[PDB]
């Protein structure tokens, strides 16, 4: 403290000689060499300035950390004609998880499952519908990043295929075309490619931008390439999300468990939902009483990419509705109620203008 030579003070503070001499120059403190003695007031001033500077270096480095959001896994939906193999592929992927069971392990159906891979994890949506609207249409907060369109090599592109493609494009998904059943004798992948090109999807093979991957969902051939391609796209699109943002997710589906009551499966997209949070999804609200993930584990928290079954909604939420964190029960009720009475007011819109004329009837 008093009196200290500059070399002593440098040792004390873990600074290089020239580094401390540079600081003394900044402060206008004079010295002959690092062997000079500092007045106590100067040394104290040094110790304080160094403390401050080191703290701001740290604060400045910690804020540069807090703006690189962590990666989140790609979310994938598998689509196409019901007989072309999307179901066989989804089943293959779901099985590929367990790898000679556990056992048990257990498993729970929460609307999506994860496929873990040396290159990363992929989330596959696994729900019986598409979302809502017509059959099988979607609105539809965006759920999936990538849509794998599974087309049978024998049958080729059909109307369910075209519907799947239009839905995926409408939802903003990146498309991967998976040409399935390639082992069949009547397999005609080249015809499917021509059909893709007729529709404006030119395969990369021919210098276009459409991603086309041959697979066999029955045997698993090509499925690994499909996963690697999903994960490559994820790295290039660079999907990220803030686990500390206000929680936001999307309802995948909801139902009544006779014992537990209203359950809803939701995919988390931003922030981290926690047991005890209030949420609103459309006109439905509740306190999150419990969350269970696909491995059957009770979760206190669910961050980006997690699919969980949530207990606590007081009415069935709709598929495709955004789940939003709110600060308390009062806010949950106000938001839900304002949406209800607004829908009810635009319903009186069509109970008035324009239902048009009435009844040209029997008998």
Author numbering: 1 to 363
Article sentences:
The switch I conformation varies significantly between the apo and nucleotide-bound states, probably owing to the presence of two glycines (RIAEK­EAGG sequence) which are highly conserved and provide flexibility (as also illustrated by higher B factors).
It promotes the stabilization of the initiator tRNA on the 30S initiation complex (IC) and triggers GTP hydrolysis upon ribosomal subunit joining. IF2 is also responsible for the fast subunit association and 70S IC formation, an event that is directly coupled to the activation of the IF2 GTPase. Here, we present the crystal structure of the eubacterial IF2 core as the individual apoprotein and in GTP-bound and GDP-bound forms.
